[PDB]
Amino acid sequence: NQPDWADEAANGAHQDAWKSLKARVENVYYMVKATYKNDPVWGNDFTCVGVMANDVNEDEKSIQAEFLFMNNADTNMQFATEKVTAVKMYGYNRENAFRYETEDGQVFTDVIAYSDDNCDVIYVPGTDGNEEGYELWTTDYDNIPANCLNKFNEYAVGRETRDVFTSACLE
Numbered sequence: 825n826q827p828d829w830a831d832e833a834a835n836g837a838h839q840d841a842w843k844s845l846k847a848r849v850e851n852v853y854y855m856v857k858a859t860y861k862n863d864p865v866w867g868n869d870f871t872c873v874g875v876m877a878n879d880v881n882e883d884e885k886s887i888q889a890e891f892l893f894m895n896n897a898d899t900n901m902q903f904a905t906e907k908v909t910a911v912k913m914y915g916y917n918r919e920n921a922f923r924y925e926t927e928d929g930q931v932f933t934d935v936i937a938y939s940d941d942n943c944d945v946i947y948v949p950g951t952d953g954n955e956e957g958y959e960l961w962t963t964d965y966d967n968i969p970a971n972c973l974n975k976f977n978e979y980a981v982g983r984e985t986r987d988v989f990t991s992a993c994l995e
């Protein structure tokens with residue numbers, strides 16, 4: 825029981841999670857759009873989510889990730905550090921998902937629906953105590969790649985899309 829884009833033979837070539845994780849070491853990834861409003865960590869009506877990574881561990885397929893975000897609870901940008909590991913979901917043989925672990929031990933496992941060198945479309949299954957939905961991440965919040973944007977809009981059909989990180993975040 826899994827999403828129709830979760831077909832490794834058809835789409836695995838564009839679902840390389842470890843490559844996508846390591847890409848966050850070189851450039852900040854900004855969550856430019858999502859289909860859901862709340863996250864247990866980032867808050868309610870969260871905006872302005874970005875992430876950068878370091879501490880690449882090839883043995884573990886892990887990085888350390890520093891996040892920035894805003895929510896309707898505080899006027900100021902918030903920050904958090906989490907471990908992220910590339911893992912397998914939906915029976916894939918090559919890692920296609922992100923396993924985030926917070927400092928308090930809370931785990932979130934999201935799936936790479938589509939990725940290219942500077943952008944990702946990530947699916948949140950909604951089984952972590954959170955809302956099911958999609959996310960669009962890009963290295964440039966002003967210039968959004970059409971390939972990922974089209975894939976996001978395709979897979980996220982039937983929902984309400986909203987903006988998360990935009991230039992307004994930097995006032």
Ligand SMILES: NCCc1c[nH]cn1
Nearest residue numbers: 863865924932934948
């Ligand atoms: N879908 C985002 C899950 C998450 C990871 N870390 C904090 N929240």
